[model samples]
Target: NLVITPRLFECSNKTGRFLATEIPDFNQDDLEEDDVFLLDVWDQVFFWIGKHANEEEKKAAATTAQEYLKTHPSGRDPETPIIVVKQGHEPPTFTGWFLAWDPFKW
Candidate 1:
């Protein structure tokens, strides 16, 4: 298990002996209308829907994330990486992540 730091959003080495890696910043400009993304991966092809999203938007998030992962593409966007969302930050605020997947590696 990994211990993630809040606010900055990082997964540590768990030993506290090395520098932690950070999750990539989400670009608001990439979002579509009424689509507030929590995280993005595989370029802009996959993203997590903010809890505020409508039911249909949640479905779309799942669909698109699956589709993109299922596709054969050239390398993914180096900027935005994947977040599997094993668990989410508590108190439910922005800019903090926990139990999410790798942000730099595929």
Candidate 2:
């Protein structure tokens, strides 16, 4: 098995366009309450939707995650699971990827 480091991205539609920007050296603290985020952990990708994220961004989450895997340098499997995680409802598997994951911080 290959050892992989998970990657985090912030997804937004601020300029009337959807964009996924990689958050360099990310951590749990990078999560913001006003935007959506994508966490790529090789085996699976998580779509973390914030409570305040707009409808457009929310609807695009799944497709975006799929596209990310297809385009990723690691050649991730397109069938890789895409999990939707709502803010404040993160699962242990999802939170475990982040360092010092504290749910109450937000």
Which structure among the candidates has the greatest TM-score?
Answer: 2
TM-score of each: 0.33, 0.87
Candidate 2 whole-model C-alpha lDDT, 0 to 1 = 0.83
Cα RMSD (angstroms) for every candidate in the order listed: 15.1, 1.6
Q: How far is candidate 2 from the true structure (C-alpha RMSD, Å)?
A: 1.6
> What's the distance in Å from true for residue 76, model 2?
2.8
Top-lDDT structure, candidate number? 2
User: Per-residue lDDT of 58-95 in model 2, one digit per residue for the tens?
Assistant: 76766677677767766556678878898999999998
Model 1: per-residue Cα lDDT over 1-106, one tens digit each: 5453322222222233323223455332333333424342224322344334456555555555444445434464444454443223312333223344333321
Give the C-alpha miss distance for residue 75 in model 2, angstroms.
3.7
Write down the worst ten-residue block by lDDT for model 1. Answer: 5-14
